[PDB]
């Protein structure tokens, strides 16, 4: 079957690849790459803040897709030190075109109550943001 | 894809069904929208039932949806089924436009006929049945036969005069009871799918009015579903009767055709599961509880358990099938699965468990392997330590936090193998660790100064453990070893040694004292040392 | 005018937007004057500020009894039992039990204005369709992107049970009038729905002139480094 | 219980397939039994049939009466006067007439279903927004493209005043759950509104797969 | 030769892979016998070892004195010193401390083998380009599917300053020869780099054949008009 | 200071630019300032030239002499046996020539930039991986398509012996910084390489943006009413 190389929910993109025997030469093997992009039509430039206008630009870099920010342990026959797998995983939140079901995105909205104001938070994803 | 369920279901006209569907363990999938839609010729999956409050008119009052967050599944009950309910169905979460779902090919049959008016027998395969065939009292002192009806001609298969069929020699036998019954009772100790068909029993050689037909149907046991997560464990409970208790069981996996054996009671084992499989003792009921750890994609498929003198899958014997689906979206943290230790040093393995079942019993054994799949407990919350150790082994039950640590000092090549993380808990988080040993490569980071410690009774004694900068920011501790664990000893620390002073001295202070470290909660490299007192 | 005790469910706006689930044990239907005593089981120290008796035009009295600081009980589902004694109505009990057997979260759908109101350029009508929710009581408000609108500027109809075969659900529709000037001028108008079964109790929906694929969409896509290195 | 005369105007169901209408009078707040007489002024061949009287939760009675055969008269703005006499309050009289001084016809606006329900493949909520009319009484009836749906099938709300200034213009709404299959097959689901202000006392609107199709959306794919 | 003092900061492998910061204080340039004294200011109990003296060209002695102050001490930014008193003359003093002014982390770039070698079946040259970092010393290691290869198979080059302007940075390009067969069997060959600026002090980049440059690519763009969830 | 003979090989620059030869016979570690004599095999035409001497750090001295020899004697492998003589030191004689027994041509390999830097649109890196050559000496240069690039704009790491088996194969790397703007216009940047075992004494390779781009760059757009997404 096909092998997966990156499946980033933030900016929905699925980059997979596979090795197929070259039809013109059984000795040679071709490396095919499949990509699946999901460009929405109702999201905004910022998905956490709804005041931003609709996003109709959708810039897609391949360096941002296969990022793997998560750290990984390394063994050099002595210590099991930790290490990162990217050089562009800096920390202001980056732009995420689409939502991630696992994550919970909320927004602050002021409301009135008996002549008083309160900062209540709302959930954009009904399925997500549950106390469990 | 991650959704698993019955790929094919077969019911009957005017009957109820209870379909179950699993899904990963997440707050979303538990609180999301469950749905049960039917797929037509246009591709659009027509929704019929949902957990939001929708119910199609066709299923009004007949079906009902329930979500079990504890089970982490959701069942779909249906009633008053018919033939029009046949078709391709789905079972997933959210919407049908996505992929989270599992196709279903429900083909509801109709009750065709009961032509033989007396006795139907539609049971499982490899089981035992009692074929009843009454007759007339006047025909008792005469013929007592049973033939097999076919589209070509009838064939005598069983008879009291030993005139039987080759395919039933030994697999069946006639039994004549007393008490003035006037009815035939025939046993069939071995059933097969080919044995199905129609049979005709009759008494008396002449034309008797008891030519009674019989409808025999041999079925297979409903494969029990097993929705397990990746890198987890599983418990295959094969509970049969006492008849096969003294026989040899087995456990195979169905491939593209036949079943590939994996393990049996004769010591055989597949190299793929070497270290992550065993067999539990056999109780008086002949129940088996095969255990497997480190689940992977290749483990998914149909598993089968049976019994035979050879302990191999032979057609015509009891069978217990399972269908295991491995969920790639597992919650178990990616463990190392291998621990490369060095002789003389020490090792600190972390055995996990569900933090809710912390008030349970935990154990730790060494996988023997070739003998018969054993697991002799070496240390636990209640079990002590044997004599082969007398140190170099202890438990450290972290108050909660999810996991507990195990220490193993004085390592040697004879300790390499496989070690499991057992516990009296239904969480089934048994992790398998492959312990690899290597020769003395370099010196240990922890070394005590007085090696042959010979203290004196009633006289202050001191012992200092080396403390390199490698663990400068880590915690340290001295603990006295016991057959149940290690008791911490409030010692003195130095900014680069770890001192330990015993102002008084009693003969009970002797034993194995340990010098270790701690990184907040976990442990690291440690060392042991025996302390004796003179007179 | 006969005796009749009833435990009034606390107001949703007094439960979500606030933190006082003031329960009321109303003893309505009394042809005779007042002079009763109220009692509760979960005595958490908060004394039941008993209220006066109102004499409706029909000619009968109705007493009330408040219980503040019972939010934890409602969230946990602890049943509330009220006992009232009176010469004409000695024995009288009322029971509260939060619905936690077949509750569903509301499904909000902020629809855009029609096609004719746009041509008029006078006033537009926005509708917020809230669907699927067993608890009848529901809260609905509107906001001008970030400024809450007064209740007198929009309308909120009464919930009604949804027909059809299945479970029990309700449905409401709130209307908001907007000027075409603010609509064309990129002003985000949102609908806020408050409910108990929702996660965090609230869900928001926004809309503007770009309701979503309004026949005029200028989309772009740039897949750079498609043949690069995917670590 | 203080007796009080309350006159009721015929409902919108008179202009329906029915024949005649019916004006009604009622006297609420009576402690004495029936026995009065509901006499009228425009009793031209119309039998002033009486009806049973009910009670309140405290003993206050409620007499009633009807006047059949006054459909054409009321339609022409004819005035009617009610007159009753009972001991507890002597004689009580009232007057009514069809209101047409400030009449405004409704403005139907059928909204399409939201794109969120399309992904569920279940039912679709079709809305029929009404607006602009003084008489809050309004008739609402859905149609499956020339088929009359039952009242329990669809849903209708109550009229409420608008949040504006200048005049009283109420509005109503109505939601209908249509099967997604029929909605995709191409079946018109019309909304019929009834009001005396409209010509023929009926207005109709239709909607199904008719809208600016989004076929003009421009997508620009660049694989630099 | 003329005597002189030189404070050598601890190495990197002895600091990141190891946590002892053996800071050295050498007294070179001496053409006379030894017999000096070394003293340190941060006397944390660890007695400073006065190593023996070696002999350089033209009979130029050289003394050294180390101090294992551990990585934590040298990491906190404490300023160390070395006061030495030699016999050939009066006395001398120096100072040394960690630097964190214009410190930048390296920008690792694991380049794949060139197509010139893929056409054959011999060895493939893997390059690990390290760029943008002020601290000169840098560690470079490789792993063949969780297995560190001996340094006798790598080809690390001394850092050299960039030719641009502005900040001061250095570059290195470690090379590793890999069998083409192993490159086709699907085995990984990652490159690890150790640096001070790096949070966690280690970065990794791993590349099998599929991450490299493919040939027949297939892109599939989708226009989802529903919710903005990726699933 | 120990007087010792030393023969310096001519830089490959002059040899691959139009110069016969220029071997330098030096006598380092000399003590006392006084002249010397240098004899050798008589080349074609030129005789001998005594260069100026200098001192060292601790006082050592060094006297040098150049021999503008012949390129034909180099290609053929002839030796320019030197012989130095002066008071206080003995008569030292050395011999050096061309290594014409095992010579390999450099296998140049020009790699493209990474996908990361190609996206930042700031500055890209180009590597000229050279390998396979017994004589570690080599001349490396860059070009801006046709113009001669300066060495102050790129780097040239020192050669190093490969970890191979058998022959003494070396390897070098040269990083060049290029602006992404030139890249967008489709410019070129080649890598000049000069070696002894190279016909024409030169070899280069260019970097036009394509450099064998992938074939069949497919693409598809999906905008149907039914998303039908897979998982
Ligand atoms: C997680 O999933 C499992 C598997 O579906 C759930 O187990 C069943 O869940 C259903 C629905 O909640 C329960 O239905 C109730 O059952 C009550 C009594 O329990 C009987 O259930 C079976 C109903 O046919 C019955 O066969 C069963 O007999 C078995 O146990 C007996 C001893 O208890 C034993 O003597 C028998 O030989 C046989 O082995 C139970 O007696 C009933 O009173 C209710 O009205 C309702 O029908 C089942 O009981 C559950 N157990 C089953 C089917 O064995 C489980 O509930 C899920 N988790 C949670 C938290 O619910
Ligand atoms: C169906 O019935 C058959 C018949 O009983 C079961 O198999 C039978 O098991 C008995 C076990 O008691 C066998 O008899 C015994 O054999 C032992 C030798 O192992 C002997 O020492 C005892 O004295 C006794 O005779 C019997 O041979 C055997 N028969 C056959 C045909 O296998 C079978 O297990 C039953 N199956 C089920 C699913 O119940
Ligand atoms: C998108 O909107 C979100 C939510 O407003 C922004 O996150 C907030 O940013 C503000 C201002 O910097 C902070 O005060 C809040 O604390 C943030 N809320 C969080 C992090 O939950 C976010 O900055 C916006 N995106 C961008 C790119 O600016
Ligand atoms: C035929 O099959 C029946 C059913 O298995 C047998 O009944 C068994 O009889 C023995 C001896 O009495 C009991 O110990 C078993 O418990 C019975 N079976 C069960 C399931 O309980 C019967 O013996 C078989 N043979 C004949 C001749 O009937
Ligand atoms: C929702 O309302 C309940 C009512 O008491 C309250 O307890 C809860 O805190 C509210 N939700 C959040 C996220 O605060
Ligand atoms: C990396 O090492 C330096 C020097 O010891 C230290 O200051 C820094 O905290 C380390 N980074 C970590 C621990 O993440
Ligand atoms: C793969 O690329 C080659 C190169 O031109 C082409 O001939 C062939 O048709 C392609 N095959 C597929 C399946 O894309
Ligand atoms: C792939 O490219 C080659 C180039 O010659 C062309 O012949 C072939 O038709 C292409 N195939 C596809 C599927 O694009």
mmCIF file of C-alpha atoms in Angstrom, chain D residues 8-122:
data_model
loop_
_atom_site.group_PDB
_atom_site.id
_atom_site.type_symbol
_atom_site.label_atom_id
_atom_site.label_comp_id
_atom_site.label_asym_id
_atom_site.label_seq_id
_atom_site.Cartn_x
_atom_site.Cartn_y
_atom_site.Cartn_z
ATOM 1 C CA UNK D 8 -64.235 38.041 19.285
ATOM 2 C CA UNK D 9 -63.662 38.512 15.561
ATOM 3 C CA UNK D 10 -64.102 35.544 13.190
ATOM 4 C CA UNK D 11 -60.933 33.602 12.450
ATOM 5 C CA UNK D 12 -59.084 33.393 9.140
ATOM 6 C CA UNK D 13 -60.555 29.903 8.604
ATOM 7 C CA UNK D 14 -63.754 31.465 7.215
ATOM 8 C CA UNK D 15 -62.269 32.381 3.821
ATOM 9 C CA UNK D 16 -61.123 28.806 3.497
ATOM 10 C CA UNK D 17 -62.982 26.093 1.618
ATOM 11 C CA UNK D 18 -65.625 26.702 4.290
ATOM 12 C CA UNK D 19 -68.826 28.588 3.539
ATOM 13 C CA UNK D 20 -69.698 31.039 6.336
ATOM 14 C CA UNK D 21 -67.916 32.750 9.226
ATOM 15 C CA UNK D 22 -68.922 33.262 12.867
ATOM 16 C CA UNK D 23 -68.854 36.233 15.258
ATOM 17 C CA UNK D 24 -68.650 35.377 18.954
ATOM 18 C CA UNK D 25 -69.494 37.153 22.209
ATOM 19 C CA UNK D 26 -68.494 36.158 25.736
ATOM 20 C CA UNK D 27 -69.239 37.378 29.271
ATOM 21 C CA UNK D 28 -66.444 36.449 31.690
ATOM 22 C CA UNK D 29 -66.652 36.956 35.443
ATOM 23 C CA UNK D 30 -70.128 35.670 36.320
ATOM 24 C CA UNK D 31 -71.105 33.807 39.492
ATOM 25 C CA UNK D 32 -74.763 33.264 38.469
ATOM 26 C CA UNK D 33 -75.931 30.492 36.105
ATOM 27 C CA UNK D 34 -76.991 31.023 32.489
ATOM 28 C CA UNK D 35 -80.335 32.553 31.535
ATOM 29 C CA UNK D 36 -79.478 35.781 29.727
ATOM 30 C CA UNK D 37 -80.140 36.461 26.030
ATOM 31 C CA UNK D 38 -77.503 37.430 23.449
ATOM 32 C CA UNK D 39 -79.464 39.856 21.281
ATOM 33 C CA UNK D 40 -77.897 41.593 18.284
ATOM 34 C CA UNK D 41 -78.717 44.512 15.999
ATOM 35 C CA UNK D 42 -77.899 43.070 12.509
ATOM 36 C CA UNK D 43 -80.064 39.966 13.034
ATOM 37 C CA UNK D 44 -81.079 39.681 9.377
ATOM 38 C CA UNK D 45 -81.975 36.035 8.856
ATOM 39 C CA UNK D 46 -79.132 34.989 11.178
ATOM 40 C CA UNK D 47 -79.969 32.730 14.122
ATOM 41 C CA UNK D 48 -78.222 33.977 17.280
ATOM 42 C CA UNK D 49 -77.408 30.487 18.517
ATOM 43 C CA UNK D 50 -76.150 30.267 22.100
ATOM 44 C CA UNK D 51 -73.474 28.018 23.587
ATOM 45 C CA UNK D 52 -72.660 26.381 26.902
ATOM 46 C CA UNK D 53 -70.962 28.455 29.598
ATOM 47 C CA UNK D 54 -67.749 27.287 31.271
ATOM 48 C CA UNK D 55 -66.141 28.205 34.603
ATOM 49 C CA UNK D 56 -62.787 29.531 35.786
ATOM 50 C CA UNK D 57 -60.355 28.132 38.350
ATOM 51 C CA UNK D 58 -62.194 30.125 41.057
ATOM 52 C CA UNK D 59 -65.851 29.837 39.994
ATOM 53 C CA UNK D 60 -66.032 32.705 37.492
ATOM 54 C CA UNK D 61 -68.402 31.611 34.731
ATOM 55 C CA UNK D 62 -68.076 32.452 31.034
ATOM 56 C CA UNK D 63 -71.119 32.677 28.763
ATOM 57 C CA UNK D 64 -70.788 32.539 24.985
ATOM 58 C CA UNK D 65 -72.767 32.870 21.764
ATOM 59 C CA UNK D 66 -72.282 32.672 17.997
ATOM 60 C CA UNK D 67 -73.644 34.333 14.854
ATOM 61 C CA UNK D 68 -73.381 32.206 11.690
ATOM 62 C CA UNK D 69 -73.847 33.531 8.186
ATOM 63 C CA UNK D 70 -71.993 36.840 8.628
ATOM 64 C CA UNK D 71 -69.061 36.186 6.285
ATOM 65 C CA UNK D 72 -70.025 38.510 3.428
ATOM 66 C CA UNK D 73 -71.205 41.201 5.853
ATOM 67 C CA UNK D 74 -67.934 41.280 7.796
ATOM 68 C CA UNK D 75 -65.977 41.177 4.531
ATOM 69 C CA UNK D 76 -67.766 44.408 3.555
ATOM 70 C CA UNK D 77 -66.722 46.147 6.777
ATOM 71 C CA UNK D 78 -70.195 45.847 8.291
ATOM 72 C CA UNK D 79 -70.398 46.825 11.955
ATOM 73 C CA UNK D 80 -71.906 44.498 14.557
ATOM 74 C CA UNK D 81 -73.234 45.222 18.050
ATOM 75 C CA UNK D 82 -73.615 42.701 20.875
ATOM 76 C CA UNK D 83 -76.189 43.077 23.647
ATOM 77 C CA UNK D 84 -76.791 40.907 26.718
ATOM 78 C CA UNK D 85 -78.621 41.381 30.011
ATOM 79 C CA UNK D 86 -78.148 39.420 33.235
ATOM 80 C CA UNK D 87 -78.872 40.284 36.881
ATOM 81 C CA UNK D 88 -75.297 40.377 38.199
ATOM 82 C CA UNK D 89 -74.470 43.354 35.951
ATOM 83 C CA UNK D 90 -77.668 44.622 34.308
ATOM 84 C CA UNK D 91 -77.113 45.147 30.586
ATOM 85 C CA UNK D 92 -73.738 44.935 28.829
ATOM 86 C CA UNK D 93 -73.209 45.851 25.177
ATOM 87 C CA UNK D 94 -70.300 46.131 22.768
ATOM 88 C CA UNK D 95 -69.467 46.906 19.158
ATOM 89 C CA UNK D 96 -66.945 45.597 16.625
ATOM 90 C CA UNK D 97 -66.148 45.877 12.917
ATOM 91 C CA UNK D 98 -63.536 44.674 10.450
ATOM 92 C CA UNK D 99 -60.413 46.799 10.885
ATOM 93 C CA UNK D 100 -59.120 48.228 7.601
ATOM 94 C CA UNK D 101 -57.850 51.711 8.526
ATOM 95 C CA UNK D 102 -54.165 50.654 8.699
ATOM 96 C CA UNK D 103 -53.846 47.494 6.592
ATOM 97 C CA UNK D 104 -50.564 46.176 5.184
ATOM 98 C CA UNK D 105 -50.102 42.902 3.261
ATOM 99 C CA UNK D 106 -47.401 40.401 4.258
ATOM 100 C CA UNK D 107 -44.117 39.954 2.397
ATOM 101 C CA UNK D 108 -43.216 36.272 2.108
ATOM 102 C CA UNK D 109 -39.534 35.331 1.864
ATOM 103 C CA UNK D 110 -38.628 31.654 1.483
ATOM 104 C CA UNK D 111 -35.136 30.923 2.814
ATOM 105 C CA UNK D 112 -33.066 27.959 1.578
ATOM 106 C CA UNK D 113 -31.830 25.201 3.889
ATOM 107 C CA UNK D 114 -28.413 25.643 5.517
ATOM 108 C CA UNK D 115 -25.376 23.894 4.076
ATOM 109 C CA UNK D 116 -24.710 22.263 7.463
ATOM 110 C CA UNK D 117 -27.735 19.949 7.305
ATOM 111 C CA UNK D 118 -26.734 18.771 3.817
ATOM 112 C CA UNK D 119 -23.779 16.852 5.266
ATOM 113 C CA UNK D 120 -26.105 14.955 7.626
ATOM 114 C CA UNK D 121 -28.364 13.614 4.826
ATOM 115 C CA UNK D 122 -31.287 13.746 7.285
#
